[PDB]
Structure formats: structure tokens, C-alpha cells
Amino acid sequence: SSCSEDWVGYQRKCYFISTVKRSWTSAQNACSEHGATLAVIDSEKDMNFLKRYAGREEHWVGLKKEPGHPWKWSNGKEFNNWFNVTGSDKCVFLKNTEVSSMECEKNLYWICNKPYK
Amino acid sequence: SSCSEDWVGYQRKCYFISTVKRSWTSAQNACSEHGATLAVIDSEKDMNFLKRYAGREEHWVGLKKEPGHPWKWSNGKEFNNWFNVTGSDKCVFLKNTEVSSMECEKNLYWICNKPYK
């Protein structure tokens, strides 16, 4: 099986959606304990699936920026800005209707992803 | 690997969500053209995933009953009634907030599934 039990496989990545809310950093730490990271979004398909999978509630995904620095993925890779992040905060979240920023310390559900096995 | 390109894998089933609306029957045939069937739901996990994946819009799933007979799955097998179908129609649909019945002739988006490869 390309993905573990309880994980969702789509476009060569395995996704997990949280059942509890935590800070961005805590969510990132939770994801890392399962070989994953806060959701990295490589394409329009990933984005549409994620907004939909997320649903009405806001969910932390793997994009955040340090003061005076470009957005960086949760796994370190550079962001090519193929999509726009609204708001003026430094951590990115999304839901079925938007992709925006929020204060990183806010407790939100989250979504992790990692490559297929 | 477990599911083909553009399908979503979860709890051993591959899912596909429509881009257009159609009658329940037309939906079943479309699913059929891809070796699948209108979404069979065997557990609360399956249901919770389908409802959120479906989103705000109503989507047809694999339950239909012919007057005089009991509900049956899109693939012909018997329904164990582990859950209750509300409303008063012969075709089941679902969305992020509910799962009920509706006139089979209505044109709704749909969701198919099939077993892992």
C-alpha cells in the first residue's frame, strides 16, 4: 500500500489530517514524528485536493516565513510563489475557501504529507 | 501505485469525484466506465472521509433501493444497514453536513470508488 492506514494517498503523496488543534510549530513537530511534514503543495491538483480535504475549518500547511525572508516550505525547500498568500502573518493555513496566513502560535488543525512508500 | 493517477486512496479503496452532475444511474455508468462503482461506504471512517471530501455540494453515493426491496449497494451486494438513510427517496447522496436520500433523477455530482490495485 502506497500509504499507511488512516492516511490519504493522492498524486504520489500521503496525507494525514489532525483531529486536534495546535500551534504551527507543534503541528510540524507532530508531523515529523511520523516521517512527515506540514503539507507541502507542489501543484494545482495538490492545492485543490487539500482545500477540499481540509473542509470548512482552517488547517496549518507547510508554508511559513521568518522576518524579512521569503516563504519557505516546512521541509526547507524554497517556494516559487506559484500561488498567493493573503494576510500579513507568517504561517500559512487553508480551508475549502481560502489560503491565507495567521499568527503561528494560534491553535489550528493541521495537515501533514510525505511521499508515497 | 495503490490507486491510479488522479484517484484518492483511503482505507483500501480508490476514490474519484465528478466534475459534472448527472442522474444517479448515469453516474453509476460513468463510474462503471472506469472499473468502479458509486461509492460503497463500509465504515464511519469511509463516511467521514466521503462527507468532507464531498464538500458543500451534494454527491451521489452507492446506495439505492427499488420499492418493495431493501437498500442495496451500487455493486449489487446487500446493505447491512450499519447506518440509517434519512429522507424518503430511493437514492443516497452525501455532503459535508449530511447523508440522506434524494430523487434518483436529480442531477448531482458523484463519487466512485473501487478496491486498491
mmCIF file of C-alpha atoms in Angstrom, chain B:
data_model
loop_
_atom_site.group_PDB
_atom_site.id
_atom_site.type_symbol
_atom_site.label_atom_id
_atom_site.label_comp_id
_atom_site.label_asym_id
_atom_site.label_seq_id
_atom_site.Cartn_x
_atom_site.Cartn_y
_atom_site.Cartn_z
ATOM 1 C CA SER B 1 0.652 2.641 -7.075
ATOM 2 C CA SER B 2 -2.346 1.594 -4.910
ATOM 3 C CA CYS B 3 -4.584 3.918 -6.965
ATOM 4 C CA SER B 4 -4.236 5.305 -10.457
ATOM 5 C CA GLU B 5 -3.372 8.860 -11.385
ATOM 6 C CA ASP B 6 -5.938 11.318 -10.079
ATOM 7 C CA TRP B 7 -7.706 8.930 -7.746
ATOM 8 C CA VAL B 8 -7.715 9.233 -3.980
ATOM 9 C CA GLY B 9 -6.678 6.310 -1.799
ATOM 10 C CA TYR B 10 -8.053 5.733 1.683
ATOM 11 C CA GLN B 11 -8.752 2.670 3.819
ATOM 12 C CA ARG B 12 -8.127 0.304 0.873
ATOM 13 C CA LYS B 13 -10.403 1.969 -1.678
ATOM 14 C CA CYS B 14 -9.638 4.330 -4.558
ATOM 15 C CA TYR B 15 -11.960 7.294 -4.935
ATOM 16 C CA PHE B 16 -12.917 9.521 -7.822
ATOM 17 C CA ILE B 17 -15.044 12.668 -7.603
ATOM 18 C CA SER B 18 -17.013 14.023 -10.584
ATOM 19 C CA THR B 19 -16.649 17.396 -12.272
ATOM 20 C CA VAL B 20 -20.222 17.391 -13.554
ATOM 21 C CA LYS B 21 -23.688 16.472 -12.290
ATOM 22 C CA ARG B 22 -25.840 13.598 -13.531
ATOM 23 C CA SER B 23 -28.655 11.278 -12.544
ATOM 24 C CA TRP B 24 -27.734 8.532 -10.107
ATOM 25 C CA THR B 25 -27.968 5.988 -12.924
ATOM 26 C CA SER B 26 -25.838 7.963 -15.372
ATOM 27 C CA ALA B 27 -23.372 8.392 -12.512
ATOM 28 C CA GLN B 28 -23.195 4.647 -11.949
ATOM 29 C CA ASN B 29 -22.457 4.089 -15.634
ATOM 30 C CA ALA B 30 -19.678 6.689 -15.660
ATOM 31 C CA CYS B 31 -18.150 5.055 -12.579
ATOM 32 C CA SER B 32 -18.543 1.775 -14.425
ATOM 33 C CA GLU B 33 -16.518 3.009 -17.394
ATOM 34 C CA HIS B 34 -13.566 3.313 -15.009
ATOM 35 C CA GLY B 35 -13.842 -0.082 -13.361
ATOM 36 C CA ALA B 36 -15.533 1.474 -10.354
ATOM 37 C CA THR B 37 -18.949 1.954 -8.793
ATOM 38 C CA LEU B 38 -20.831 4.687 -6.955
ATOM 39 C CA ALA B 39 -19.045 4.943 -3.605
ATOM 40 C CA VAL B 40 -19.539 1.973 -1.260
ATOM 41 C CA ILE B 41 -19.287 3.013 2.412
ATOM 42 C CA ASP B 42 -18.238 0.286 4.852
ATOM 43 C CA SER B 43 -17.310 2.256 7.973
ATOM 44 C CA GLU B 44 -17.502 5.503 9.883
ATOM 45 C CA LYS B 45 -14.009 6.307 8.612
ATOM 46 C CA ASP B 46 -15.202 5.870 4.995
ATOM 47 C CA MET B 47 -18.241 8.012 5.694
ATOM 48 C CA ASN B 48 -16.375 10.780 7.459
ATOM 49 C CA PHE B 49 -13.880 10.924 4.601
ATOM 50 C CA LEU B 50 -16.563 10.927 1.908
ATOM 51 C CA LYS B 51 -18.596 13.671 3.583
ATOM 52 C CA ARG B 52 -15.648 16.042 3.927
ATOM 53 C CA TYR B 53 -14.139 15.104 0.548
ATOM 54 C CA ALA B 54 -17.568 15.753 -0.997
ATOM 55 C CA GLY B 55 -17.696 19.261 0.427
ATOM 56 C CA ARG B 56 -20.650 21.653 0.340
ATOM 57 C CA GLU B 57 -22.260 20.231 -2.807
ATOM 58 C CA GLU B 58 -24.358 17.086 -2.710
ATOM 59 C CA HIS B 59 -22.796 13.989 -4.238
ATOM 60 C CA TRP B 60 -24.378 10.679 -5.182
ATOM 61 C CA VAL B 61 -23.025 7.554 -3.468
ATOM 62 C CA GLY B 62 -23.564 3.806 -3.856
ATOM 63 C CA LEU B 63 -26.925 3.196 -2.159
ATOM 64 C CA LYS B 64 -30.235 2.815 -3.954
ATOM 65 C CA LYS B 65 -33.395 0.853 -3.298
ATOM 66 C CA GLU B 66 -36.204 -0.307 -5.540
ATOM 67 C CA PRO B 67 -39.639 -0.102 -3.833
ATOM 68 C CA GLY B 68 -40.531 -3.367 -2.122
ATOM 69 C CA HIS B 69 -36.847 -4.239 -1.790
ATOM 70 C CA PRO B 70 -34.233 -3.209 0.836
ATOM 71 C CA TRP B 71 -31.330 -0.831 0.191
ATOM 72 C CA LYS B 72 -28.567 -2.372 -1.935
ATOM 73 C CA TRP B 73 -25.030 -1.233 -2.828
ATOM 74 C CA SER B 74 -24.166 0.122 -6.267
ATOM 75 C CA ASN B 75 -22.291 -3.131 -6.866
ATOM 76 C CA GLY B 76 -25.317 -5.309 -6.170
ATOM 77 C CA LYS B 77 -24.272 -6.576 -2.732
ATOM 78 C CA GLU B 78 -26.657 -6.360 0.209
ATOM 79 C CA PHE B 79 -26.560 -3.411 2.611
ATOM 80 C CA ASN B 80 -26.077 -4.337 6.287
ATOM 81 C CA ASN B 81 -27.788 -1.108 7.343
ATOM 82 C CA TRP B 82 -24.961 -0.205 9.707
ATOM 83 C CA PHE B 83 -26.222 3.355 9.211
ATOM 84 C CA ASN B 84 -29.679 4.913 8.634
ATOM 85 C CA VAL B 85 -30.750 6.704 5.456
ATOM 86 C CA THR B 86 -32.886 9.758 6.255
ATOM 87 C CA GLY B 87 -35.373 11.498 3.977
ATOM 88 C CA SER B 88 -37.784 9.479 1.854
ATOM 89 C CA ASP B 89 -36.234 8.773 -1.542
ATOM 90 C CA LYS B 90 -34.591 5.774 -3.179
ATOM 91 C CA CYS B 91 -31.079 7.186 -3.842
ATOM 92 C CA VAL B 92 -28.469 8.204 -1.274
ATOM 93 C CA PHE B 93 -26.270 11.281 -1.502
ATOM 94 C CA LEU B 94 -23.967 12.977 0.941
ATOM 95 C CA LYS B 95 -22.150 16.219 1.621
ATOM 96 C CA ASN B 96 -20.030 17.712 4.416
ATOM 97 C CA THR B 97 -23.110 18.223 6.605
ATOM 98 C CA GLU B 98 -25.315 15.238 5.810
ATOM 99 C CA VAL B 99 -26.073 11.918 4.166
ATOM 100 C CA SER B 100 -29.668 11.280 3.107
ATOM 101 C CA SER B 101 -31.851 10.241 0.185
ATOM 102 C CA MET B 102 -32.991 12.200 -2.882
ATOM 103 C CA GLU B 103 -34.994 11.633 -6.072
ATOM 104 C CA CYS B 104 -32.735 9.475 -8.245
ATOM 105 C CA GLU B 105 -33.423 11.650 -11.283
ATOM 106 C CA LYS B 106 -31.828 14.732 -9.733
ATOM 107 C CA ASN B 107 -28.555 15.868 -11.311
ATOM 108 C CA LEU B 108 -25.788 15.840 -8.734
ATOM 109 C CA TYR B 109 -22.012 15.451 -8.738
ATOM 110 C CA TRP B 110 -20.986 11.937 -7.717
ATOM 111 C CA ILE B 111 -18.185 9.925 -6.108
ATOM 112 C CA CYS B 112 -16.957 6.475 -7.162
ATOM 113 C CA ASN B 113 -14.613 4.023 -5.511
ATOM 114 C CA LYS B 114 -13.038 0.628 -6.071
ATOM 115 C CA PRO B 115 -10.513 -1.608 -4.278
ATOM 116 C CA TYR B 116 -6.761 -0.925 -4.130
ATOM 117 C CA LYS B 117 -4.716 -2.287 -7.053
#
